[PDB]
Amino acid sequence: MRECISIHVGQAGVQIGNACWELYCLEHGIQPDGQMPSDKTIGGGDDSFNTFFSETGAGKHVPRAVFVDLEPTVIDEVRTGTYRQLFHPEQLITGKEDAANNYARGHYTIGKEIIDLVLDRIRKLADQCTGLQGFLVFHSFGGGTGSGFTSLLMERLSVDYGKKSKLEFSIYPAPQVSTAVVEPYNSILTTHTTLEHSDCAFMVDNEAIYDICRRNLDIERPTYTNLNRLISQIVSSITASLRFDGALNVDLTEFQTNLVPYPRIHFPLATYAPVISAEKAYHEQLSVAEITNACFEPANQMVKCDPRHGKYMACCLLYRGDVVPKDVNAAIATIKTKRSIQFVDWCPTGFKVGINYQPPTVVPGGDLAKVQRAVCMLSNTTAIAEAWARLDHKFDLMYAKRAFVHWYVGEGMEEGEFSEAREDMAALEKDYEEVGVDSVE
């Protein structure tokens, strides 16, 4: 068999997981009570695919996931909402008090004596899985739970299980927009610990999706329940080869092998095909060439970094729906012919290809439209150094006066732990500046 545990951490991850499972249940045929009348009407098939859903003898389907926030105001919606009867009642809140946007309480003061429950449920949900494996952590750089608890959980799972494919679909801080005056510290503090243990972390930024959603979907007044659905579509395009049958499959370790040349440069970007609204679904072809040419378009990128100031170390293209390989190959050749998409000379191959047949679903009451084909890009480029050069500057302004630091030392943390965590990120930036240079023989 094959399996993938999904862990959600914080209020970013929960609100994302809700959307992801709203999509998964509708893709497979499960309704919120766990049952599946689709099987009872059809009478066969593994459509209740066992990568994400464990199955009891009573016909129920309970999903392989945990989600934690250290404050019950969020998850208690799940213990009251539509998906009450689906998820296991072990949704490990221990939220007597929140992490207050500091890594200091998420890593030690309100972290210790609670993570043991998480690791216990992970042991209980791994021994039920005799198959391919790999974990998906959904968190946000910038919170006290998305930073410290994540850095605490990964440094333990890298002992307990070890040689497994761990992944992180993490929210990223926007340059201008930000809903906190402390994310510059939490970001780099989390990157220090989650740069050795993790294997490939995909990053997404709220500002990019906001700027997309009005340009294409014609929404001038968007919310968090209309970006979290696109995020779920990305996760589904990443996790579909495990579930559905296809012409050319790509599994969890393959993303880790293609897109991570060195151990430390495992932080790529993501895209989809959202030039697709309900009215603009007509008036348009939605071929393979047109959709794949939305890859290199910065207006459709989901992280704020113009790739034209950098080069592509690697790229991966996962296609859903009715797609034929020669269309993908013509797309790749038309891309390589151009000169705006620079490629590192140590990667003439560049691309992966992955094809599956089941098209994406339409989460009803939603913005996206029914399609016959969908595409996802995962791109490791040297441009994102700029997207860090801002953060490491912000640090260097507010760490000059030692500002917002007594709240962190007050919850057990060193004042020399930020100087030691900011001397590693500059080395990473220097690494990106090193690999991007072409060799002179």
């Binding site: 105001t73 969020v74 008090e97 809903t179 005056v181 510059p184 302004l397 000059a400």
Partner: protein
């Protein structure tokens, strides 16, 4: 779940907390008996944040009313929401302070702090987890300043990990409802700066000018100002009681709105504030609320923000909204008005959005700000003080109760250093 213990020191504390419980009950659906008479199932899910349960489905608030000289206590019992409070929690002694900080910190405060702290322990140890505390007092006067500061010191000695969030009415520029205001304010600031995490400097002249200009009221009594202050009080601790998209709390606001610990004096504000006729001639949206918020005529501090730079500000929203519009507007405010913002903080704003608005509105916002204009709330106090202390004007009443001049010079020295730490960031760097 997270919980608060309110204390009510001074007439003002007790004249405001009544109106605050009148607003909490209105939101949570409780009558004077304590009985639930609401409509939705989302008022009782987190009722523990302020109230405790009882036997016959009744709910009793966690109030501790300490006031020397029982005159202002009697008024509550003969009021609308007086018979919901616990009689065991009304703690008062006779012979009131007399607008003396000595007779509310040293003598009678020392008599009546044990009986107060006993009920504090009684209410706190009966909480699952505790976040912090809450106190409403008026500086300048007697009881509310001295006894409040004494309680704060004792409590932060007992429970230092938890928040102590004072909502303090401060002296005014021109009005003087009390003549010994600067001395008591100086001593109270000397006691609050070291022993507080976030306090809010309300001022009465700003509330009058809000009541006259915006609301276009003609006979504004005290209950209307208390109405504005309760409004803010309720909005601060919303994301503990109700859910939303980006939940905040007291400790997130504390970690964010306080770059250094001594600069924990903020300017508040409330927003939708309109007249009875001018509500048909606008449109409630995020930009109108933000414009009403960053205006100098909806802040309660009696300090024009345009005389100093904002170190940090916070906006707690309530209602169905769009985070895109929120962040776009809070970014436009930074990019247009950068001269009023600090440069060593790249983003000076945070946000917080609940999903359940007040009983009869679709949107609501509260605003908080750590600024540098607050100088002119304390510099004046350091000028009134030294004009009086240089001649020993109102002094013998205070030396007569076991005190010295050294304490007064110290307090002056601490307020001036606060003003210096503020002035350090009022010129561009």
């Amino acid at each position: 779940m997270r919980e608060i213990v309110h204390i009510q020191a001074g007439q003002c504390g007790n004249q405001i907390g009544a109106k605050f419980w009148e607003v909490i009950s209105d939101e949570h659906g409780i009558d004077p008996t304590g009985s639930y008479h609401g409509d939705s199932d989302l008022q009782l899910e987190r009722i523990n944040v302020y109230y405790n349960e009882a036997t016959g489905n009744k709910y009793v608030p966690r109030a501790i009313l300490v006031d020397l000289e029982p005159g202002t206590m009697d008024s509550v019992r003969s009021g609308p929401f007086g018979q919901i409070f616990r009689p065991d929690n009304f703690v008062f002694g006779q012979s009131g302070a007399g607008n003396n900080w000595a007779k509310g910190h040293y003598t009678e405060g020392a008599e009546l702090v044990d009986s107060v702290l006993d009920v504090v322990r009684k209410e706190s140890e009966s909480c699952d987890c505790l976040q912090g505390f809450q106190l409403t007092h008026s500086l300048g006067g007697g009881t509310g300043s001295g006894m409040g500061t004494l309680l704060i010191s004792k409590i932060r000695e007992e429970y230092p990990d938890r928040i102590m969030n004072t909502f303090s009415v401060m002296p005014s520029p021109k009005v003087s409802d009390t003549v010994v205001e600067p001395y008591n304010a100086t001593l109270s600031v000397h006691q609050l700066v070291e022993n507080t995490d976030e306090t809010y400097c309300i001022d009465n002249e700003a509330l009058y000018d809000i009541c006259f200009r915006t609301l276009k009221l003609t006979t504004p009594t005290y209950g209307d100002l208390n109405h504005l202050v309760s409004a803010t009080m309720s909005g601060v601790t919303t994301c503990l009681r109700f859910p939303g998209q980006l939940n905040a709390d007291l400790r997130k606001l504390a970690v964010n709105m306080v770059p250094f610990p001594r600069l924990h004096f903020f300017m508040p504000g409330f927003a939708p504030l309109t007249s009875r006729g001018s509500q048909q001639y606008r449109a409630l949206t995020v930009p109108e609320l933000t414009q009403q918020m960053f205006d100098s005529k909806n802040m309660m501090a009696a300090c024009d923000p345009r005389h100093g730079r904002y170190l940090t500000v916070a906006a707690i929203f309530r209602g169905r909204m769009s985070m895109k519009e929120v962040d776009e507007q809070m970014l436009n405010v930074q990019n247009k008005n950068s001269s009023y913002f600090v440069e060593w903080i790249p983003n000076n704003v945070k946000t917080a959005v609940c999903d359940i608005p007040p009983r009869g509105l679709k949107m609501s916002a509260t605003f908080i700000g750590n600024s540098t204009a607050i100088q002119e709330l304390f510099k004046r106090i350091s000028e009134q003080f030294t004009a009086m202390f240089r001649r020993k004007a109102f002094l013998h009443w205070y030396t007569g109760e076991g005190m010295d001049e050294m304490e007064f010079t110290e307090a002056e020295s601490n307020m001036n250093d606060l003003v210096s730490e503020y002035q350090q960031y009022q010129d561009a760097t």
